[PDB]
């Protein structure tokens, strides 16, 4: 009795009791800084709003012609952009008091508009959650760490069940991890806090305890409880002894009474069980929306050689 997992390499020699505590192979991740979304909130205003804007914007050219009949080719949209995006660009107003009405509607559309988009954006950027930049053991980061300025360093304790499980599925993984052995759980946490280790791989229950018993409650484990090789604990016993089937009854009776949740007060409870924009350099998407226009301004410059043929 104690912390002792169940596997196949031990079941050949020893007989086992009923599985006892759910566990597996998990991974403790570093305590990284908080991150906002990698783009500005360009999510679906473009589906309805950004396309209705142009088609309700272009319709005023007829009335802009009609007020001069009783200044539209280039000046109309040049006026109609300056007030929708809240700017005092030097723009001549149109003639007459009859032209003054629709701009006074458009200004009220502008004040409704920008206060909407600031509203939705301010709702969006104080409710969005940090996303888990590494996920699963099948990632390229958890494969051979080739293309990474200084590459990933995986920690493990080199004597036990997890080494014998990882040596039978991924040989080159533990062949790389052999340089990164650890001598203890707290030495693994001290090596993770001092930048000496990037990630740690161990059992699920001990890691889920020490996630909840750190003095801070920064980032802990990949995902929420995703374990790789789900197994259990148990109680080892003499092989095919008669005392097996009794404990096999009695443990199930314990499962029948709920006394593990009464024994929870010593067991796995804790503090913080999932209860600054220096990263604002994610704006490169709108910088790509800048430089794409910096391409198109050259493209239109090239098609401004067409009066040479006309």
């Amino acid at each position: 009795v104690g912390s002792l997992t169940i596997n196949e390499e031990r079941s050949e020699v020893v007989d086992f009791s009923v599985p006892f505590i759910e566990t597996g192979i998990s991974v403790m991740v570093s305590r990284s800084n908080g991150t906002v979304s990698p783009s500005a909130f360009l999510e679906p205003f473009s589906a309805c709003v950004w396309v209705m804007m142009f088609v309700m914007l272009l319709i005023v050219s007829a009335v802009a012609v009609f007020v001069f009949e009783y200044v539209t080719i280039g000046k109309a949209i040049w006026l109609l952009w300056g007030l929708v995006f809240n700017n005092s660009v030097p723009v001549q107003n149109p003639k007459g008091t009859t032209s003054k009405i629709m701009v006074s509607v458009w200004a009220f559309f502008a004040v409704i508009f920008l206060a909407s988009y600031t509203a939705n954006l301010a709702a969006f950027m104080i409710q969005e959650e940090y996303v888990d930049q590494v996920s699963g053991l099948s990632d390229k980061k958890f494969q051979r760490p080739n293309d990474f300025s200084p590459p990933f360093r995986f920690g493990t304790v080199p004597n036990g069940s997890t080494e014998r499980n990882i040596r039978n599925n991924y040989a080159e993984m533990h062949a790389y991890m052999g340089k990164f052995n650890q001598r203890g759980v707290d030495d693994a946490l001290l090596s993770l806090k001092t930048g000496k280790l990037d990630a740690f791989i161990y059992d699920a229950a001990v890691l889920n305890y020490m996630a909840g018993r750190d003095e801070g409650c920064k980032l802990v484990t990949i995902g929420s409880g995703k374990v790789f090789a789900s197994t259990g604990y148990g109680i080892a016993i003499q092989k095919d002894s008669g005392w097996k089937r009794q404990v096999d009854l009695a443990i199930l009776q314990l499962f029948g009474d709920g006394e593990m949740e009464e024994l929870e007060a010593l067991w796995l409870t804790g503090i913080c069980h999932n209860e600054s924009q220096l990263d604002i350099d994610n704006m490169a998407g709108v910088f790509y929306m800048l430089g794409a226009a910096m391409a198109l301004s050259l493209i239109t410059f090239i098609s401004e050689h067409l009066f040479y043929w006309q």
Partner: protein
Amino acid sequence: ERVQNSNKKEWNGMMGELLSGQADMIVAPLTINNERAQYIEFSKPFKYQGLTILVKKEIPRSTLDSFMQPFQSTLWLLVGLSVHVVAVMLYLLDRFSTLSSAMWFSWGVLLNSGIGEGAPRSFSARILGMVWAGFAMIIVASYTANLAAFLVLERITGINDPRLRNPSDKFIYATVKQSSVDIYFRRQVELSTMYRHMEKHNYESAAEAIQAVRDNKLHAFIWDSAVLEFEASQKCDLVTTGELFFRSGFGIGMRKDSPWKQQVSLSILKSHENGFMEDLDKTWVRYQECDSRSNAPATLTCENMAGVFMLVAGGIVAGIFLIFIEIAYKSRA
């Protein structure tokens, strides 16, 4: 159960057919209990899961229907009357120290639209215009904050909820009859009254109660997490509510002392070793979603814009008629 009003206890359903020799192995989601494992050998139990509660998600709306009307009761036209009377006041201040155009000034002060007018010559109107612009900034800032307030702004929790622990009529609870939940409840004495409230509403199959929760005839349902967490990921209108009670795993039910009892306890573990079950549940269990109900109201549904665009859709129609009336006035005088 004790059947035939005598001293006979038979096993209903599937396990009686295991006991009667109708089969020799049970490969199904069959839980591990103390009462079934009295004389029926199991295996290493496939999985780890627990019991959880299933309820129906609500509507809650977005603020789309406030198309520029969050407070249109008190988004008053009184402020427009204030515009008109301060235009009259600036007119009288400029008169008795640019006359009919004062409202075309003042609206251009309001809407941050540089419509082509002249400043008042007297300073007494200018000092009013200063605090008028300050007031305009105040009301637009208050409108922004009150628009954000609409867009920034609790179900049952376990068996320790007084909606569920202490019974009532306003909540209906049910589980599948003759199942392990009915065993766990009749075994427990502290939940006995709950079970006595459970005896009048139970169902016979899982899909019956799953369809009956969505018809609001049954406010809650109790079953395993490894089915309800899949069902709340496919029929994407319902939700679970967290914690587990009776943590176990579905095991293979075998007849007692069959010679395969050492083989199948190995090969299950082998399938847990070489990554087979992760392919299996990736193929079968976690293959589909709609959306994880984390209750994030910070999202769009700016789908419709009808109530905010209809003001300009009526303006484009009425404007040509007002232009015709204005040029008929220009022709007249």
